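Notebook entry, cofactor series.
This is the third protein in the set we're modelling with a bound small molecule. For this one the ligand is zinc ion. I'm keeping the input format identical across the series so the outputs can be compared line by line later. Sequence and SMILES below, as received.
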Amino acid sequence: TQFTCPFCNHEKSCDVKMDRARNTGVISCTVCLEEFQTPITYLSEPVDVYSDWIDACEAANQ
Amino acid sequence: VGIRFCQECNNMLYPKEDKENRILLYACRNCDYQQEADNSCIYVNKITHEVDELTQIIADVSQDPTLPRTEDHPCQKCGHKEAVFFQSHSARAEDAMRLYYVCTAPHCGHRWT
Amino acid sequence: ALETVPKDLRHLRACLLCSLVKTIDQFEYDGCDNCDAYLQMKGNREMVYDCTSSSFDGIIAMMSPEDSWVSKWQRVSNFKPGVYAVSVTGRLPQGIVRELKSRGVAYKSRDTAIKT
Amino acid sequence: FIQMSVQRIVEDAPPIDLQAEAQHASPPRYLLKFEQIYLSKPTHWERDGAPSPMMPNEARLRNLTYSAPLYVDITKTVIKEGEEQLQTQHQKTFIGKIPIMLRSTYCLLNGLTDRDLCELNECPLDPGGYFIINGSEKVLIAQEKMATNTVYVFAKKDSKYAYTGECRSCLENSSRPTSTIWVSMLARAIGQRIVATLPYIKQEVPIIIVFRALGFVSDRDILEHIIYDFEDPEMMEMVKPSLDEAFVIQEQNVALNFIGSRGAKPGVTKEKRIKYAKEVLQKEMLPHVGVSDFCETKKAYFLGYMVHRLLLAALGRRELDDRDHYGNKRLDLAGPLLAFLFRGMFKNLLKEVRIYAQKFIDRGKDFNLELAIKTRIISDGLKYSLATGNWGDQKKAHQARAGVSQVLNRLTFASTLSHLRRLNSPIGRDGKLAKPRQLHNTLWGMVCPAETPEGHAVGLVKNLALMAYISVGSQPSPILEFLEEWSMENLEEISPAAIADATKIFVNGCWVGIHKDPEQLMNTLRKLRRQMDIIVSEVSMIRDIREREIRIYTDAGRICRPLLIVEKQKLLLKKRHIDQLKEREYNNYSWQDLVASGVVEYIDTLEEETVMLAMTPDDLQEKEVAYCSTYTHCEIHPSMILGVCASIIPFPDHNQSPRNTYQSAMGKQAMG
Amino acid sequence: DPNLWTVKCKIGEERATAISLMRKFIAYQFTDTPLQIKSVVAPEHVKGYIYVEAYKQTHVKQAIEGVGNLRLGYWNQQMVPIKEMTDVLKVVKAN
Amino acid sequence: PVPPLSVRPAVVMQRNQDDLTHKLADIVKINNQLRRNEQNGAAAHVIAEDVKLLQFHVATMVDNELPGLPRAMQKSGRPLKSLKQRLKGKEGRVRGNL
DNA sequence: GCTCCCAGCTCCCTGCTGGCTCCGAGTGGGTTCTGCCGCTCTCA
DNA sequence: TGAGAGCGGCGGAGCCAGCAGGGAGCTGGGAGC
Ligand SMILES: [Zn+2]
Ligand SMILES: [Zn+2]
Ligand SMILES: [Zn+2]
Ligand SMILES: [Zn+2]
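Returned structure with ligand:
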């Protein structure tokens, strides 16, 4: 459930919250307070949300 | 049963209700292709699993050297004396000591119990 | 400019004024990359001994004097990229210090090591 | 081993290329190719040099190691930054010395006559087959194991899985070890979903995701590889749950990300994930079916077959495989054991040579290959593993399995003979599971039923039958060339429409193709094997009739026995054969001619499942009250089912069976 | 400010490695793939590792790539605590 | 506490020190390193690593086998016989010698 | 401003999954094995 | 500064602790007056 932050590079500083009611997976860093939201399916895992966040960060950086 | 693929994109059709007409229709998940149903039946489950093994019996099994063959039971179709006989394999069989006979002669292929 | 980095680990000295670490041969040949205009250390082994001290603590590689916090900590943010020691122990001769003061160059000790 | 396997291990090792660090410059490449081995007969190498042939008796007396030095040739081609290649070759480079087996084709006693052996203070009656190390005899006990490249479906008790289908896959004795893959069905809210445990992946993956990742994006296409007959609603309704679990991933790339994310390596950037998953599917998953630039269609067909096999077992159509059935066992003899050890040991030598060369070229001065190779690592390593018994690297001696290569028992000739013919099950002793220890039906005529140690290893250490022969293995290429001439179509050409009615052909476990006519092809293959034309005697060919598979096996370690062939209730052995054999000293008409005549056959356990045997020709092939009228083989003599120590008991059928076992154990201790 | 990382190095060779690192930086500062790290610090009594200043650990991994002395520190590098930053440069020393 | 020589005797001919003496040597060696290192360098990072290794060595003196931890190995790889291993089980001090 | 009823928070309970220890008693032999590379300082 | 050499370092079963999910039961905000 924890991952290394891509922005403030703090290991285990990322926590993932699953909201199945709205079908969203949210990952928050506990150091730089970076917030990212991405839709999830019923078959989804925190690694998928982390993967989605890293892809969005790479796309934002082009 | 009648499990039927989408004509256009080749995928499983899913059952659906047309609520305005309360009519069962088979609709693809991917295109708007729809079809009218002809069995009102969707899910069927034989819990007792009274399966007729004669559907699964293959005539080619008559070529087995290790199987026993007899002439006391003649074929009801062609009257041929020689016939190979063997039992069921599955635990689900309704009769444990059920004996299946396959006609030994080529191209009769008659199978009975 | 590789002239601001050592070619070998023998007879290394540190400039007492800017903490530049070079071989004594480099100091003799090309002088100090940051003090030769005020010292004229080229071609004078005795003057090299006077102004550079073989004894120092630490090694720091410096690449971005304008973009390094260690440059600010060491007060070397206006010096050329090179091999810079963390602490250089020693003191210049009094005559050279007075000459620098007369020119207008204040002499601050590079021995930032905590004593006792 | 010493003829083919050492050469292929040396040649298939990748060439090493290594450059410098560009010191001050921030640098060139070279190849160091090994190509051909040259093996010498054993030689002394006393302190002075000047080699002379070492006689095994001398090795025993002087505590030497009866070994033979081997040499390899290396061509090192180095290019420099000026764009020019310098190619220097070295012949007869000393790599090490391999301990050699007595009376083998490379021993000094090979081909000698009895008078010559008596001159050398050697016993003509000594069967050899053992190594001499530090002047002590060592015997590599054969080690049994589960067969490879074959789908096994088991049903473990009290686990989250109802049924699991596994296929331990290996290439042609390549560097990679057994890369097992599991396909399991969950144990039933909604259920009976199917997951795959594939190598280098942390979490199990649903099968339809793997199929999507493999390159099949449609639904009918995926189903065609699993269900061969769409007219079976039971299979459709059983597989649709796992199919609806994958409703959300309709392209290859998303599935590729799905696999890469679940990697055991740290999981960070998109293309990294894609490449990792593609590599896992290309080389780590199912290697035996093919590791090449394009094997996706063949890999998908085999995976679909495993799922189909799992569905059949879970539907009761087929029966779960038995772990004790000797058709699923393989015996590693000296050859495969030494090959497994030598592969990793040669790799270690290459790594040390690479380290030495890199250290010297960091300064950019020349490296010397003579000092680069350490001749000690192979020779002293082999000597250690065969002297202590720990099969593996010395640095991990606790992890390595022990008990292999025991001291040859030299109390009585029967003891020596029995020790040379011994199979060991590598299962933990002092276990409370008695099923592996029981005498299984498939041991008939291949493992002596009387002879086992009575201590804590009852039923684990077992002796070999008198006429049992263990296959040595051969290439399946000629069989493949023959098959596709005889109206056999590969998977890449057939459509799944006709895959239901035809029979599937397996060669060494890999699904090669399909054929429309199952019967007259087995006849042709039987004729070839009885003529030895294109199919050697060891190849075993099994046709399953109820289940349309027909399998061909050419692996090593399969155990088999000779049986007389029967045609229409009559032996093929006639008076002329016996007449020729009875005068054998003058006509050199040996057993090999009898095999070549098409009279006898070698049958292993898999083929013995589908054969009809006759205990005695005269007494069981006659007109009487018919029991069977379709006997296929006959036994040469029942007394051949016993072993070596159990073949000295007079009237062993007039005794209680525990007494026979006690005599088998006690015959090894009788003084003579 | 860029982050400090400890990169594993051979014992007794750390000094030559730092000089070699700086030399390679200067050489690569004119190429399409320059060394994006900032500075290298080799204290007097630090054995088996070197301090490196970079914003991203990926920059550290790429910059130290190809260095034999840092092959053990190639796969993993350790985040220096921020409050410990002042102790990287702290030097202490009659008798 | 370090036990006397009777608890950890040294054999005369194959001096080969006891499996416990080698662990004692690792403990004292790393103790001196940490002592000296925190005396002068006081770098606040190597102290953490030194403490971790010292706490690993101390723990594996008494209990060599732990879940999820590497076992201390003698040269030729064989794991050390800890005090708990000496005393635990069928061949031990209590059940096998008392 | 008054009493009171309905949702939000507190508690305990139940249920489930991961982690540690045990696996007969004696006896006799034999065999292998107890690290290794090299790197810097000293006597010559 | 080279030889001698000192050593420096490189399977299975069955009990206990934590976690997760789910109700009864108490207290502030609104329903009536
Ligand atoms: Zn962060
Ligand atoms: Zn459609
Ligand atoms: Zn008929
Ligand atoms: Zn200077």
